[PDB]
Amino acid sequence: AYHFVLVPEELDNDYWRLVEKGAKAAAKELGVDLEYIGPRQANIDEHLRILKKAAAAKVDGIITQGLTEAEFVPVINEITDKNIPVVTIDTDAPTSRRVAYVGTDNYYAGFLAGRALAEDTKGKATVAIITGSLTAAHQQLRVRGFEDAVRQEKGIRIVAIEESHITRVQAAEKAYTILKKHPDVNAFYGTSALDAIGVAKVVEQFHREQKTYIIGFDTLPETIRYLQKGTIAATVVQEPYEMGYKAVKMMAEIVAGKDVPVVTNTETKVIRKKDLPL
Ligand SMILES: OC[C@H]1O[C@@H](O)[C@H](O)[C@@H](O)[C@@H]1O
């Protein structure tokens, strides 16, 4: 009876709970034991601790983010040398010895965000970026993709980048700080699931909705509420359920000796109020 472990970035984060639903649905489907374990609070040192722990515990396969190249590559290769196969999810480490990746093309998601912002503001924007962190690999890619997409827009300019450590509260905090310091900011870009929600709270508190474009990530309920209301103008779709489901099925194929593709990019697109509901 196969035993796999899935490690989220943070246990009770709303987006990861959707990943867990798809993983446990696939696990039930194959008669597989899925253990979902990860830090209470997103923390790179604990994250590495939960992985090395799960490795020494007889498990048949480990599904995890490849969060940072400097730390997670040695650990993944560590876990591989114990003849335990690793599947990366949501954030890839393409230089490690993980067998396969299931998750968004992160650069492209950020690139599609930049393209939408430039269409919506028609080339004119003073932009602040709220990102989950400056060291997480998917966050960097979503930032770099966005920069690349807007570089040709002479009238788009990025004035600030701050970290939210993927909470609502710290996204709101950073939006209070950016706005006080850059009152000409008329556009926000959030790169993780809770960022546009924190920005939207502050924009609504200041009655700034009419002079602030907000494009964020993912489709958590409150993002859809702000999207229908108007506070948020667009959001980059991800497929957390389907990537939780395909990561498990892909693990089951790997330990069954079957060939599998190295990368499987779940779908990503920018949606607006006109694409609701889904
Ligand atoms: O809320 C934080 C989450 O937001 C999502 O956009 C990302 O794909 C996850 O890596 C991240 O942990």
Automatic annotation (TrEMBL):
**Residues binding beta-D-galactose, per UniProt:** 9, 13, 16, 90, 138, 142, 193, 218, 238
Identify the residues that the record assigns to the Periplasmic binding protein domain, covering every copy: 4-258
Q: Which UniProt keywords apply?
A: Signal
Q: Which residues form a coiled coil?
A: none
Could you tell me where this protein is found in the cell? Cell envelope
Its primary localisation, in coarse terms, equals other
Q: What's a single GO MF annotation on this record?
A: carbohydrate binding
Q: One cellular component GO annotation, for this chain's record?
A: cell envelope
Q: Which residues cross the membrane?
A: none
Which family does the UniProt entry place this protein in? Belongs to the bacterial solute-binding protein 2 family.
Can you name this protein?
A: Putative sugar binding protein
What is the gene called? ganP
